[PDB]
């Protein structure tokens, strides 16, 4: 077997794991933050704007992490380290 074939198979599996973890984290975190925001809206019609500030921060702390994974996925799949 060509060693690069093994490298690429392992890289694809690693990238798949990275994406799976990132998507699970992003979905769960965004759902939880949105649940908080929706409950806050329901309690207070007029609290909407003041709640979007912290909410976005939460999203920023989640999506950012998710997108970080994306970068490394590419590094795994396209510029695979250890390729030879």
């Amino acid at each position: 077997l060509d060693p690069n074939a093994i490298i690429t198979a392992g890289a694809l599996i690693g990238g798949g794991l990275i994406m799976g973890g990132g998507a699970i984290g992003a979905g769960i975190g965004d759902g939880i933050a949105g649940n908080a925001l929706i409950s806050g809206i329901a309690r207070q019609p007029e609290a909407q704007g003041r709640l979007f500030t912290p909410f976005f921060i939460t999203v920023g702390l989640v999506e950012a992490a998710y997108f970080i994974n994306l970068a490394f996925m590419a590094l795994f799949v396209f510029a695979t380290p250890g390729l030879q």
Partner: protein, 45 residues
């Protein structure tokens, strides 16, 4: 006491509406008795 209904941010109740209602109704009756006593005293004077 009877109940009267009127057509017309929701309040937050701590711990829950039922316990507060139970703990407040006797207090309301005490308030009404006190008001009755005050009116009686004024009428007596």
């Amino acid at each position: 006491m009877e109940v009267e209904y009127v057509g017309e941010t929701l309040y937050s109740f701590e711990p829950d509406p039922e316990t507060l209602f139970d703990a407040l109704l006797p207090r309301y009756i005490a308030t009404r008795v006190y008001a009755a006593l005050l009116e009686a005293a004024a009428s007596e004077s």
